Enzyme design. Sequence first.
Site, PDB file in Angstrom:
ATOM      1  CD  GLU A 163      -3.027  -1.071   0.200  1.00  0.00           C
ATOM      2  OE1 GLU A 163      -3.107   0.039  -0.476  1.00  0.00           O
ATOM      3  OE2 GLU A 163      -3.818  -1.962   0.058  1.00  0.00           O
ATOM      4  CG  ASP A 188      -8.061   3.718  -4.534  1.00  0.00           C
ATOM      5  OD1 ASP A 188      -8.571   4.264  -5.585  1.00  0.00           O
ATOM      6  OD2 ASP A 188      -8.706   2.988  -3.832  1.00  0.00           O
TER       7      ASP A 188
END
Length: 162
Positions: A11, A20
């Site tokens: 991440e 994202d």
Amino acid sequence: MNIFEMLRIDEGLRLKIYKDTEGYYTIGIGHLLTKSPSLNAAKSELDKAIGRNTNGVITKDEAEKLFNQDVDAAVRGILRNAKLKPVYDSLDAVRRAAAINMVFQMGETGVAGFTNSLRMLQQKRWDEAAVNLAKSRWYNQTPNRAKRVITTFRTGTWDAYK
Ligand SMILES: CCc1ccccc1
Ligand SMILES: [Cl-]
Ligand SMILES: [Cl-]
């Protein structure tokens, strides 16, 4: 190696609101804020999560705190899911981390949508499960991360992360 380390690699860490891979407002270590296209809605959600007026920016400690809560929630979500729990309990420690990674990334519904793979992992048919896992939008959209998680389920080692 552990789940936290694994997810920190997958991440990244960002202290300012960002979008994202799917274009959704996120912050920290993959903490989704909202699917709404509104930056303000995202900032609102952020302040609600941190407990202060952040103005779109958080500290490393705050990031890590959201992270702990999110991992905790993912696991808890798995345990509460009738479809997932049995599989998860059948796995060894390394593979469990692979399972948590998937739920953290795509939520419990998402994963709960991989029926055939679930059954194959439960039966410990690793190579076959690995092939079935790859036939998914997940793999096609985030191939390098999917490959790492898939290798983990296939091998039961952290080799993909070394
Ligand atoms: C389908 C991967 C998985 C396995 C067990 C539990 C959660 C997720
Ligand atoms: Cl939260
Ligand atoms: Cl990727």
